[PDB]
Amino acid sequence: PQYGIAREDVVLNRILGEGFFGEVYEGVYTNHKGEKINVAVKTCKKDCTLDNKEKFMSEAVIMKNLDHPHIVKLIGIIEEEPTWIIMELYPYGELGHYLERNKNSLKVLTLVLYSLQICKAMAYLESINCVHRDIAVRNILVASPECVKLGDFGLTRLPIKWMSPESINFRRFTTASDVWMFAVCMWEILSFGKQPFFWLENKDVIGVLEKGDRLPKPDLCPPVLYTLMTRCWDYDPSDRPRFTELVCSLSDVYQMEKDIAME
Ligand SMILES: CNS(=O)(=O)c1ccc(Nc2ncc(C(F)(F)F)c(N[C@@H]3CCC[C@H]3N(C)C)n2)cc1
Q: Three-state SS across 163-188?
A: CCHHHHHHCCCCHHHHHHHHHHHHHH
CB 151 within 8 A of CB 141: yes
* Residues in the chain that come right before a backbone break, where C and next N are over 2.5 Å apart: 155
Among 213, 195, 94, CA closest to 142:
94
Q: Which residues of 147-167 are buried (b: 16+ CB within 10 A; e: fewer)?
A: ebbbbbbbbeeebbbbbbbbb
Please say whether the beta carbons of 119 and 243 come within 8 A. Answer: yes
Residues 205 and 161: beta-carbon distance below 8 Å: yes
Exposed, middle or buried: residue 92 (CB in 10 Å: 0-12, 13-18, 19+)?
Answer: middle
CA 258 to chain centroid, in Å, comes to 24
Facing residues of 41 across strands?
Answer: 25, 86
Is there a contact between 133 and 172 (Cβ–Cβ < 8 Å)?
no
Answer yes or no: is the C-beta of 22 below 6 A from any ligand 1 atom: no
Amino acid at 15: I
Residue 3 near residue 54, CB atoms below 8 Å: no
Taking alpha carbons only, the member of 262, 129, 250 closest to residue 190 is 250
Give whole-number Cα distances, 2 to 38, 73, 110, 171, 187, in Å.
20, 20, 41, 45, 46
Alpha helices of 89-242 — where are they, by DSSP H?
Answer: 95-101, 108-127, 165-170, 175-190, 202-210, 223-232
Nearest CA owner, ligand 1 atom 8: 93
Binding residues for ATP: 16-24, 42, 88-94
Residues 6+ away with beta carbon under 8 Å from 30: 9, 10, 11, 36, 37
**Are the C-beta atoms of 86 and 74 separated by less than 8 Å?**
yes
DSSP H helices in the chain: 50-65, 95-101, 108-127, 165-170, 175-190, 202-210, 223-232, 243-262
- Please state at what angle helix 243-262 crosses helix 223-232, rounded to 10 degrees: 170
State whether the Cα torsion 261-141-171-128 is positive or negative. positive
Which domains does the chain show, CATH number per domain? 1-89 (3.30.200.20), 90-258 (1.10.510.10)
63 lines ligand 1 (CB under 6 A): no
**Closest to 144 (Cα-Cα) out of 181, 102, 199:** 102
Residue nearest to atom 20 of ligand 1 (CA): 40
Strand partners, 26: 14, 40
Q: How far apart are CA 32 and CA 53, in angstroms?
A: 28
Supply the angle between the helices 175-190 and 108-127 in degrees, to the nearest 10.
Answer: 170
∠ CA 39-43-49, nearest 5°, is: 160
Number of alpha carbons in the 13 Å side-chain half-sphere of residue 137? 24
Technique employed here was X-ray
Side chain identity, residue 163: M
Q: Which residues contact 211 (CB under 8 A, 6 or more apart)?
A: none
How do beta strands 23-30 and 10-18 pair? antiparallel
Contact 231, 241 (CB under 8 A): yes
For this entry, resolution in Å reads 2.0
To test the ligand 1 pocket, which listed residue (38, 41, 90) has its Cβ within 8 A of the most ligand atoms?
90
Q: Residue 54 to residues 21, 114, 145: CA-CA distances in angstroms?
A: 11, 32, 35
Of 199, 197, 16, 176, nearest in space to 93 by CA = 16
Q: Is the CB of 134 under 6 A from ligand 1?
A: no
Decide if 143 contacts 92 (C-beta within 8 A).
yes
- The answer to whether the beta carbons of residues 132 and 83 sit under 8 Å apart is no
- In angstroms, what CA-CA distances link 133 with 82, 140, 144, 225? 27, 13, 24, 23
